[PDB]
């Protein structure tokens, strides 16, 4: 009598109120006495009282079923990833026993019901991925036991409310990805003593970071990224005893990185990139055993402290786009599983550290636009983890290690604008994933290896401004995925063959300023996607092939060769006046 | 950068069955290491080479963001929809090659603002309407093919069009003028 219920009847009313195209609610049989064994329904006690309803990803369409609030013992409701639509009803407060409410990834629209704060048992509120608009209700400051407030990815257009700082029980404040009216971070957020997460990414935040945030000793994640925050990073953030992640990237922050960040024992991830930060990266910060340090696109200067190499957890260092001087730490990568290194667009000098890939996890080596000198470390020949190598615009010298040519997962190898010498090793055949090979403006010598043709996936070969010599390997013509071949300013000799027909995807052929001899092959016309052809500064001989007329070329240079005969009819226009100059018998 | 963001916008709207745009990673600082993209020494795009890539879908106005673009090659694809008017904001363009596609609608009057254009190949499309008179004011134009389209109206015979032959304007719906067989009302 006292503890009898009509919970099954109430759930049938919910089923009737919602569209169920995929028949997720088929198990909900009106005939069954109890709803406790129905799909998504849990009764955690005696009395067969429904305590939990989970209908996640059920493709249910319709407004919130306010009848469900007649389930007296409902403590957990999830309608996550459904098509629940219309306004959230004010009579949701009738669900007075709800501890967890997840209405995330639905079509809910309109203003937030203030009656959500009138549910005293509510601990977890997730409304992420909805169309909610308007100001956050003042009632939200009066939540009695709320630990999680998530309003992420909505259309909330009000200011960030200071009253949200009045929820003493709050552990997670998640207001990210909302078109909020530009507003400062309320200093009253410092009063949230139990807060573990402050996620305010892309919330149109303005003004300075309040020093009060330093009082949040339980904070684990501070994310104020993608805002317009101005001023210095507060030295008070040294007070964040339990912080693991600090994200301040893409703001208008100025001033020096506080050394007090060294006091954060649990800090593992810091990203203050895309700011206007000035001064040196502090030694105390680098002494912390960080997993990820990103300080790229700032105005930072001075040397990178050698302490950073001490961390056994470092996989990510992106400090590109600064004025950092001196050498990289000697022991970098020796004690850490370094995966991503980007020190590009800096004033770094000296040899590359010898043990960057010691733990065998280095995927990206990006050091472009620096004054790095010396030889590639021989260890990197065994770094098979590497996928992207950019050593361009440095003062590097010496031969490339044999293994480095043959690394299996490297997609881009760029050694451009160095003084690298020696030959491309036959090991190049082992570069199974190599798409872009750029060796331009070096001192490379010798013949292109025959194994370069074994690279079926090669898309770009650019080796201009080198001392490469010899006949082109026959295998080079076998490359059917090659779109760019630039070998200009070399000592290449010999004749092109009929094999040029296999360059079906070639857009640019530049063989200019070489010592090429022989007739231009008739198969040049078979190249349907060729739009740029430079064979200038060679000793090419004989009649220009008639097939060249058929090609739709945006650039043609056959100048300074030994070509003979009458110019093909179509190529004899005023537009091609500078294309065939310096051919006496033409 | 802005240029990479614009090219990524094109990638999202284009349909790429053979993943020719796989290398087009928006997280890169610039698109210069992207395959099918060529940049200048100042790292600004001067060439987009996507001819015969089996591309479908439509172009975007954001292509106009590429101020230093000199060669746009989208030929031998199944691209549909209008030629964006914002392509007229490509001041340094030398080649516009949209031929062998399913492009429809008008040839934009904005294309007249391309002062350095030498190559305009819009042939083998479903383009309609009249050939813009603005194109005559392009002194640099030396190659023009508007053939195998559904264009109509008077064919301009002045400025750059003075030297153009009938092969440029062939197989159109209702073109009139001295280059054409039929003279104009």
């Amino acid at each position: 009598s006292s503890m009898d219920n009509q919970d099954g009847f109430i759930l049938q009313q919910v089923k009737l109120s919602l569209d169920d195209p995929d028949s997720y609610l088929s198990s909900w049989n009106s005939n069954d006495a109890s709803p406790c064994r129905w799909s998504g329904v849990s009764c955690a006690g005696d009395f067969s009282s429904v305590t939990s309803v989970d209908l996640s990803s059920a493709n249910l369409a319709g407004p919130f079923p306010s009848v469900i609030c007649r389930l007296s013992n409902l403590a957990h409701l999830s309608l996550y990833n459904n098509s629940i639509n219309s306004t959230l009803p004010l009579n949701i407060a009738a669900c007075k026993s709800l501890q967890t409410l997840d209405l995330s990834q639905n079509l809910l629209t309109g203003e937030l019901p203030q009656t959500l704060a009138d549910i005293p048992t509510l601990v977890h509120l997730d409304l992420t991925g909805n169309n909610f608009s308007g100001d956050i209700p003042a009632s939200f400051g009066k939540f009695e036991n709320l630990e999680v407030l998530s309003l992420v990815y909505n259309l909330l257009d009000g200011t960030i409310p200071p009253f949200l700082g009045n929820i003493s029980t709050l552990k997670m404040l998640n207001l990210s990805y909302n078109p909020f009216s530009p507003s400062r971070i309320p200093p009253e957020f410092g009063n949230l003593t139990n807060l573990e997460v402050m996620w305010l990414t892309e919330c149109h935040l303005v003004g300075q970071i309040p020093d009060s945030l330093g009082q949040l000793s339980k904070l684990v994640d501070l994310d104020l990224a993608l805002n317009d925050l101005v001023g210095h990073i507060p030295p008070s953030l040294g007070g964040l005893t339990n912080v693991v992640q600090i994200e301040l990237y893409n703001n208008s922050l100025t001033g020096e990185i506080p050394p007090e960040l060294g006091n954060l024992k649990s800090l593992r991830l810091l990203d203050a990139s895309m700011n206007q930060l000035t001064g040196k990266i502090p030694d105390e910060l680098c002494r912390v055993p960080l997993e990820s340090l990103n300080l790229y696109e700032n105005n930072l200067e001075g040397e990178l402290p050698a302490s950073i190499a001490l961390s056994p957890n470092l996989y990510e260092i992106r400090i590109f786009g600064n004025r950092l001087t001196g050498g990289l730490p000697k022991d970098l990568g020796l004690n850490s599983p370094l995966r991503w290194l980007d020190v590009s667009e800096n004033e770094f000098s000296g040899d590359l550290p010898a043990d960057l890939c010691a733990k065998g996890e280095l995927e990206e080596l990006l050091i472009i636009h620096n004054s790095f000198s010396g030889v590639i470390p021989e260890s990197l020949a065994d770094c098979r983890s590497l996928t992207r190598i950019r050593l361009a615009y440095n003062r590097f010298s010496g031969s490339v290690p044999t293994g480095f040519w043959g690394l299996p997962h490297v997609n881009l190898l760029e050694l451009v604008n160095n003084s690298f010498s020696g030959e491309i090793s036959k090991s190049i055949g082992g570069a199974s994933n190599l798409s872009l090979l750029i060796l331009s403006n070096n001192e490379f010598t010798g013949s292109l290896p025959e194994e370069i043709g074994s690279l079926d996936n090669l898309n770009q070969l650019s080796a201009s401004g080198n001392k490469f010599s010899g006949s082109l390997p026959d295998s080079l013509m076998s490359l059917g995925e090659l779109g760019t071949l630039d070998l200009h300013g070399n000592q290449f000799s010999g004749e092109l063959t009929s094999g040029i027909k296999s360059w079906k995807k070639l857009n640019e052929l530049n063989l200019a300023d070489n010592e090429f001899t022989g007739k231009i092959p008739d198969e040049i016309g078979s190249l349907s996607v060729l739009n740029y052809l430079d064979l200038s500064g060679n000793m090419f001989s004989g009649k220009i092939p008639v097939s060249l007329q058929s090609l739709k070329l945006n650039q043609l240079n056959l100048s300074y060769n030994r070509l003979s005969g009458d110019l093909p009819p179509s190529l004899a226009k005023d537009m091609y006046k500078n294309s065939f100059i310096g051919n006496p018998g033409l | 950068n802005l240029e990479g963001d614009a090219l990524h916008t094109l990638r999202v709207t284009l349909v790429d069955p053979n993943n020719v745009l796989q290398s087009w990673d928006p997280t890169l600082v610039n698109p210069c290491t992207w395959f099918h993209v060529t940049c200048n020494n100042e790292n600004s795009v001067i060439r987009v080479d996507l001819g015969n890539a089996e591309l479908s879908g439509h172009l975007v106005p954001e292509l106009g963001v590429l101020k230093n673009l000199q060669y746009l090659e989208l030929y031998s694809n199944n691209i549909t929809g209008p030629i964006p008017s914002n392509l007229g904001n490509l001041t340094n363009l030398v080649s516009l090659d949209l031929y062998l596609n399913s492009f429809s609608g008008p040839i934009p009057e904005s294309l007249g603002k391309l002062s350095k254009l030498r190559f305009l190949r819009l042939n083998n499309n479903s383009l309609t309407g009249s050939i813009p008179m603005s194109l005559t004011n392009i002194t640099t134009l030396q190659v023009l093919d508007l053939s195998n389209n559904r264009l109509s109206g008077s064919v301009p015979d002045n400025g750059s069009f003075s030297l153009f032959t009938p092969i440029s304007f062939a197989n159109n719906l209702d073109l009139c003028g001295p280059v054409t067989s039929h003279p104009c009302p």
Binding site: N81, Y153, Y177, Q245, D271, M274, E297 | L28
Partner: peptide, 14 residues
């Protein structure tokens, strides 16, 4: 379904 970018480091690189 809206894909929400997780709280974590920025991913821009050369």
């Amino acid at each position: 379904y809206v894909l929400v970018p997780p709280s974590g480091p920025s991913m821009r690189h050369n």
